[PDB]
Amino acid sequence: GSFVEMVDNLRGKSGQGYYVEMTVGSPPQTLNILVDTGSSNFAVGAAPHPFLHRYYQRQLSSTYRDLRKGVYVPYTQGKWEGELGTDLVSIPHGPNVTVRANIAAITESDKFFINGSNWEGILGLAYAEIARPDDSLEPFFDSLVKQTHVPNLFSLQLCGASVGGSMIIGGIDHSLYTGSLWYTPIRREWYYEVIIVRVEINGQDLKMDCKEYNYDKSIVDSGTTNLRLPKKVFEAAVKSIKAASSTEKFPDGFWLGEQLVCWQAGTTPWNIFPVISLYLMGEVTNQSFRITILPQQYLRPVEQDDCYKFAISQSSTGTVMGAVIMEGFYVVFDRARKRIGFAVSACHVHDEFRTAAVEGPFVTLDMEDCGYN
Numbered sequence: 001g002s003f004v005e006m007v008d009n010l011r012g013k014s015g016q017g018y019y020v021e022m023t024v025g026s027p028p029q030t031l032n033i034l035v036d037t038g039s040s041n042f043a044v045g046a047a048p049h050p051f052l053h054r055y056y057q058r059q060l061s062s063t064y065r066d067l068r069k070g071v072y073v074p075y076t077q078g079k080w081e082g083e084l085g086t087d088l089v090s091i092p093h094g095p096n097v098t099v100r101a102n103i104a105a106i107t108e109s110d111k112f113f114i115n116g117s118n119w120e121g122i123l124g125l126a127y128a129e130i131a132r133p134d135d136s137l138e139p140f141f142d143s144l145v146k147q148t149h150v151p152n153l154f155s156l157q158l159c160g161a162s163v164g165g166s167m168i169i170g171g172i173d174h175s176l177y178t179g180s181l182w183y184t185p186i187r188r189e190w191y192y193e194v195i196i197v198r199v200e201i202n203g204q205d206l207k208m209d210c211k212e213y214n215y216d217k218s219i220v221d222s223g224t225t226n227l228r229l230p231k232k233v234f235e236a237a238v239k240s241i242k243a244a245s246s247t248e249k250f251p252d253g254f255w256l257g258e259q260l261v262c263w264q265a266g267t268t269p270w271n272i273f274p275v276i277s278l279y280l281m282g283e284v285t286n287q288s289f290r291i292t293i294l295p296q297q298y299l300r301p302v303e304q305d306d307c308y309k310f311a312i313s314q315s316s317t318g319t320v321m322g323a324v325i326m327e328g329f330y331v332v333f334d335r336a337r338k339r340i341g342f343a344v345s346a347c348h349v350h351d352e353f354r355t356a357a358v359e360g361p362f363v364t365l366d367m368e369d370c371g372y373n
């Protein structure tokens with residue numbers, strides 16, 4: 001159908017993630033919450049922090065229940081640390097429901113909250129398997145679906161260009177995509193893990209053992225800015241991208257995502273840069289489909305001139321189809337049918353002569369062999 005109250009309920013800063021408004025507690029305390037399909041905890045600032053401007057005040061909530069258990073979430077750059085509890089949660093620009101949910105009240109953190117991001121918490125929309133401290137801590141979306149009649153599905157239109165978009169909870173809004181939704185199976189319910197079966201740069205096959213594309217996994221992750229690629233794939237991809245864009249040379253550092261590249265306002269030569277196609281395993285035997293993104297997706301605008309960072313980066317933990325991938329597409333997390341749908345976003349950034357694309361089917365044999373174990 002349409003979901004007009006949910007359309008345009010996401011905001012963000014470029015490279016700092018998309019957030020949605022949520023209320024916690026009785027009476028409701030409004031907070032801006034990162035929409036993160038790459039994690040499974042609902043965690044909110046619950047104490048002062050230099051970069052937090054409002055936080056969850058549990059003592060002010062009558063419906064707050066203390067679970068009397070700590071949670072510690074270390075990772076690459078830092079950590080967050082907090083106190084588990086439950087409280088009533090709503091999404092003002094969401095479905096008209098209120099659910100009791102687990103909430104991690106973040107008390108201590110390091111390099112978690114980003115200066116000027118305007119979000120104060122994280123909504124992990126992935127599965128319980130990757131929830132902290134363990135999978136017995138039911139994620140918000142699980143609770144939402146269990147406590148209401150909201151279908152087990154959500155969809156994200158992340159528009160990029162300050163950034164905005166939409167999270168449609170419990171449905172698919174046709175106003176937000178053009179052409180067909182193509183579905184890839186969720187290989188395993190933990191992250192939203194998918195299988196990439198082929199990769200092209202301007203139609204030229206990267207020509208690797210397709211396992212390399214999914215080493216050690218490939219996931220769809222709204223909480224990651226970049227397209228991240230396994231070392232082997234990243235190098236081959238960058239090699240090909242360089243070759244395709246070779247009428248202009250850029251510094252080594254640009255390709256590492258360090259340095260900006262700038263052009264006179266409006267003269268960015270999009271056309272010299274190649275499109276990137278990921279073929280995803282289809283739902284039908286021996287069928288794949290492809291999603292195609294533009295440089296307008298993988299060259300992230302950064303603050304006279306129009307400046308950009310290269311938003312494809314190397315990974316050691318597999319492929320991450322982050323906001324770079326997602327901003328081309330309306331992405332349907334069809335949990336009920338263990339699949340993820342892609343269609344061309346009606347809001348994606350493109351130029352006169354090229355658009356992101358979702359096309360299929362393609363005969364692709366032995367696609368299970370592309371999965372890494």
Ligand SMILES: Nc1nc2cc(Cl)ccc2n1CCCO
Binds near residue numbers: 036038073221317320
């Ligand atoms: N999306 C995401 N949200 C996260 C939250 C934390 Cl605390 C750590 C890592 C996170 N990631 C990365 C997962 C994919 O590599």
